[PDB]
Structure formats: C-alpha cells, structure tokens
Paper text:
Neuronal calcium sensor-1 (NCS-1) is the primordial member of the neuronal calcium sensor family of EF-hand Ca2+-binding proteins. It interacts with both the G-protein-coupled receptor (GPCR) dopamine D2 receptor (D2R), regulating its internalization and surface expression, and the cognate kinases GRK1 and GRK2. Consequently, in the Ca2+-bound state, NCS-1 folds in such a way that the two lobes are oriented to jointly present a large, solvent-exposed, concave hydrophobic crevice onto which peptide, proteins, and other hydrophobic molecules can dock and bind.
The crystal structure of rat NCS-1 (hereafter referred to simply as NCS-1) includes four canonical EF- hand folds; the overall fold is similar to that adopted by human Ca2+/NCS-1 (27) and its yeast ortholog frequenin. EF1 and EF2 form the N-lobe and EF3 and EF4 the C-lobe; intra-lobe hydrophobic and hydrogen bond interactions help to stabilize the conformation of the two lobes. Residues Pro-177–Leu-183 form the final helix 10 (H10), which makes several hydrophobic contacts with the C-lobe as follows: Val-180 → Leu-97, Leu-183 → Leu-97, Leu-183 → Leu-101, Ile-179 → Leu-101, and Ile-179 → Met-156. The crystal structure contained two copies of NCS-1 in the asymmetric unit, related by noncrystallographic 2-fold symmetry. In the absence of D2C, the C-terminal segment residue Pro-177–Leu-183 forms α-helix 10 (H10), which makes hydrophobic intramolecular side-chain interactions, hydrogen bonds, and ionic contacts with helices 5, 6, and 8. Helix 10 forms one edge of the large ligand-binding hydrophobic crevice, rather than occupying the hydrophobic ligand-binding crevice. At first glance, the mobility of the C-terminal region observed in the NMR experiments appears to contradict the observation of a single conformational state in the crystal structure of the full-length protein, where this region forms a well defined helix at the edge of the hydrophobic crevice.
Numbering used by the authors: 2 to 50, 60 to 131, 139 to 189
C-alpha cells in the first residue's frame, strides 16, 4: 500500500508556496521524480545518471540538509531557484555551489575546482586556470584571493555574459 506515490495535500500546498511552481506543476514534477526514483530519495549515483565531478558539486547544493540524499522538497526548491529564480536568487544559489566548504568565501582554489569540473564535463580561455584568473581579476576587489558574497554578486552583475546566463526563466 505504497504511501509515497503521491504527495499529501498539505505538502502540495507547502511546496507550491515555497516555489515558483503552480500546484499542477509541483504534482507533475513529483510524478516524474517518483517514477525515476521510487524510493523518493535520489542518491549521488542516481544524480550522476566525465561529468562526475560537476554532478557531485551540484548534488551537494541540492542536498540542503547534507544527509546524502536529495528528497523531493530539496529537488523541487533547487529546480525552482535555478530555473525561475530572480537574478539575485540565482546568484545566491551559485555562490553556494562555488563555496565548497560553506565558509562564506569562494577561494581561487574552490573556484578552480568547479571550473575544472565544468571543463571536464579559444586560447585565452583554454584552461580552468585562465578562466579563474580572469574571474578574480574582475571580481576580487581587495586582492585577498577570495570572493565574499558581495564581491561575487557585484562582480557577476558587471559582466553582461553572466547576467544573461542567470536571467533565464525555464531556459529562456
Ligand atoms: Ca537531503
Ligand atoms: Ca569557501
Ligand atoms: Ca576579496
Ligand atoms: Na556590465
């Protein structure tokens, strides 16, 4: 008598209120989620399914409570921010992605780890090192080798390409 094939009504209401989705959209996302992960808990191996490193970094941000599983509430809220969030919401989310040790700063090495993963997944951009050097030249204002949330927000907003990439809604 499986009890998690659909959401409880109160949870449909909760999740609709916490995201940019309609009730119908929340239920549609659950249908697909539970089909692909009947346990209701998506683990790192499942999320994975060369992209290994970057999928693992994204997995950790989806995993809000850090218990090694992405449950639906986590899945749908991450989808909400990354697909439909405002520019500032998406920037806060991206900062969490890059801040690997959750200390409130993105170091050069933290960023390098992410950018390498993206690459693993034009001469002046042909290494992760070059890409990071450029980002830090543009965003690190006190030259201490790390980005505060403010440095990352303001730095990102200065660059038209970054603004474009974070200003989409359902990919458009
Ligand atoms: Ca979790
Ligand atoms: Ca950090
Ligand atoms: Ca700095
Ligand atoms: Na600009």
């Amino acid at each position: 008598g499986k009890s998690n094939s659909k959401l409880k009504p109160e949870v449909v209401e909760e999740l609709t209120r916490k995201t940019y989705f309609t009730e119908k959209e929340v239920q549609q996302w659950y249908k697909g989620f539970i089909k692909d992960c009947p346990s209701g808990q998506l683990d790192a191996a499942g999320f994975q399914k060369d992209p290994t490193k970057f999928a693992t970094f994204v997995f950790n941000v989806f995993d809000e409570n850090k218990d090694g599983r992405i449950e639906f509430s986590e899945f749908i809220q991450a989808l909400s921010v990354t697909s439909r969030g405002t520019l500032d919401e998406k920037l806060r989310w991206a900062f969490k992605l890059y801040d690997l040790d959750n200390d409130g700063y993105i170091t050069r090495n933290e960023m390098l780890d992410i950018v390498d993963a993206i690459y693993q997944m034009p001469e002046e951009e042909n290494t992760p090192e070059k890409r990071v050097d450029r980002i830090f030249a543009m965003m690190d204002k006190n030259a201490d080798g790390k980005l505060t949330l403010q440095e990352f927000q303001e730095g990102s907003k200065a660059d038209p390409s970054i603004v474009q990439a974070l200003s989409l809604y359902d990919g458009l």
